[PDB]
Amino acid sequence: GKSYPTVSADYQKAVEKAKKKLRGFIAEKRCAPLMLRLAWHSAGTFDKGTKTGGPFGTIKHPAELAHSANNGLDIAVRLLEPLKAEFPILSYADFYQLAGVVAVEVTGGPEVPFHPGREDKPEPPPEGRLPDATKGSDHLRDVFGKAMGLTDQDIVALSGGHTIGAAHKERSGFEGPWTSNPLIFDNSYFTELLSGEKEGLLQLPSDKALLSDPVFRPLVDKYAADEDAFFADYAEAHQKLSELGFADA
């Protein structure tokens, strides 16, 4: 149920050029996980019942960066600002979603389709919509299913975003990477979740919740067995996340 907007040829050209510049920058600075986190924190505030929040460029505002879940993302916004300045025609909304797509590509992940045309909105959403790492399955369905409108499959596939990056005790309080190879986008998140706790590696309560829910667990097992199936489901879920509230039929 998407009807994407028309954008000018100049807009399209800037998208193409920004994608290239983002690849080089993200690779050089080793910041793919942070850019994926930025894209996710931008989009995951959407509430389908009120049509508020979502990937509309608001995360750059001080009021939204002040949300406690957003500890550390001020760094991401500042890192990208000089590059955004080379592409004045793009919305911030598009630019941050494009950075998220590129972060997955450059770490070896699937090619997530991208459609331009998000408009920047003035008003940030209220604090509190992003999921709590200490809660379990019911909470995950309330946030991704009831608020965002994604499926059970999308929840499990998107949790695999933790295959890259790490938590920090100065940001969330949790500490360490989920995988041995935190700059490579692979299915290691799921093989680690299955094999249990291992000193040096993180599992959040929210990650463990996938192991004991009757619907999530068979999807974990599938993605741990079959990286290609993970990639296909991941790309569909990321595209839906990046488009919440946008171009809805």
Ligand code: HEM
């Ligand atoms: C399912 C619920 C989720 C919860 C509760 C959650 C929670 C967290 C927490 C607590 C952190 C650590 C922040 C820090 O201390 O630096 C984190 C990091 C991260 N999250 Fe998730 N997250 C979830 C879903 C997602 C999704 C859907 C994505 C993307 C598709 C994502 C991508 C990431 C990445 C890449 C990092 C690492 C950032 C870095 O290395 O600096 N997360 N998340």
Ligand SMILES: [Ca+2]
């Ligand atoms: Ca990995």
